[PDB]
Amino acid sequence: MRKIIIAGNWKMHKTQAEAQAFLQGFKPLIEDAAESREVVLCVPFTDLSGMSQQLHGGRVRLGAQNVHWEASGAYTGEISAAMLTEIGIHYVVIGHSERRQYFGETDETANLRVLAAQKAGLIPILCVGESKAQRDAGETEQVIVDQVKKGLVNVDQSNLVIAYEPIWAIGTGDTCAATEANRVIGLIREQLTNSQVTIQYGGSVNANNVDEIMAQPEIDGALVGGASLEPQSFARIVNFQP
Amino acid sequence: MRKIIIAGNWKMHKTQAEAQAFLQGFKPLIEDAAESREVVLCVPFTDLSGMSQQLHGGRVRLGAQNVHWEASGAYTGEISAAMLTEIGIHYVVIGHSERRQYFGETDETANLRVLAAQKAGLIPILCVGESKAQRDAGETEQVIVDQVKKGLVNVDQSNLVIAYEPIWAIGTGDTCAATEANRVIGLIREQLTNSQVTIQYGGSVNANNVDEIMAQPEIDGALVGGASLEPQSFARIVNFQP
Ligand code: NA
Ligand code: NA
């Protein structure tokens, strides 16, 4: 059985004080979620250490939202794997569409970041997804296959999460049809050498479509943006039925 | 007199443990430094909170190495001004050439980040600098004029530091001649409405050229990369002599 992973991508939200208030409201709500479900909060760099303290010994895992591909060096503004493992966090989001759109991320640098994360013992969540223009031009399959191939060069597929996030579904409320997400995620799984990789859907997941999305046989989890920002919403997604 | 500011840009170096060890060796060496000299360490996001607790009541100020231009939002991996001011830090490096080279920074986004830092009460250090290609083409002056103009739209020039870092001098050991840094920095100062702005030189500053660089009439400080990584080196740069 593949691992179920419900991950919240806070993006650029929440001071440490706001993160603490979230956790005050969130921890009681997921106490009885099935123990086998992995719950991850992927939070700003400046929230990691404080939240690490508040979560130690509990079930909730922390993720960073980026990591650089070198161990150290002349990359002003970047955070290294060693900085993250010192805090003891478990996950890192890599290759998110917003870093490809705005901040120069390529398939090649995404791959290198994944490798750096793995060698440090972090669990990478590699994000892939086609644009509206690519989808409209009929290019989804080719784009996704190429992002997966380039993203996974030399990557250990026993320590890997993939999130399919069609770019047009991110933050728009235009959730991808669950059967179409299943279709593309099935195509991703076909490219893999380890078919047991957890593959998530992301893109306007909310408490009212999580059940339907998780009901798809190829889909093993969700990377949740806006609906992960408040406790009750994210808890209902963690507590998806059945 | 303009404010003298000696800033260390650690770039992607130092875990919290390594940052703590640096401060142990560094604090004794600048205890008696001239009180008029502002000493700044610009450190990775994950070191800011821990170092801040070790620095209360001291003279050493902290800077971050980036900040985003929006207060919050869908910018996975980015840190907002509110996240930094919560920690209480004083400075932020903006528009460093490494962000422009690798991570999609433009003059326009550097400007917007400067505005965000200022509105939060952070002191921005805006980095400008020409490439080797632009330098060899005789385009330094036009390039710098353009970066300063675009970088400073709507910017409060009473809360502003500029670092001139010719790109070919960064991390190479090819330090720009002091009188040439002085010449270009004079041209920068001519473009400002507030002539009292602190303008730093950056690019292979070390303990053996800091005296000559600081003696130039237009140069008010230094943004120091590799030579800020260990305490004895950086202290001698803080303790520059006539
Ligand atoms: Na499923
Ligand atoms: Na001077």
Side-chain angles (χ1 to χ4, degrees), chain B residues 29 36 50 52 59 65 69 71 79 116 139 143 150 153 220 229 235:
Chain B
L29 302 183
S36 52
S52 156
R59 59 180 298 162
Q65 289 173 18
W69 63 85
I79 299 300
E139 304 178 337
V143 162
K150 292 170 166 171
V153 180
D220 309 314
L229 289 172

Side-chain angles (χ1 to χ4, degrees), chain B residues 134 138-141 143-148 187 191:
Chain B
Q134 293 166 330
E139 304 178 337
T140 298
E141 294 90 345
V143 162
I144 293 307
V145 159
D146 205 64
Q147 293 194 315
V148 167
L187 294 179
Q191 202 173 341

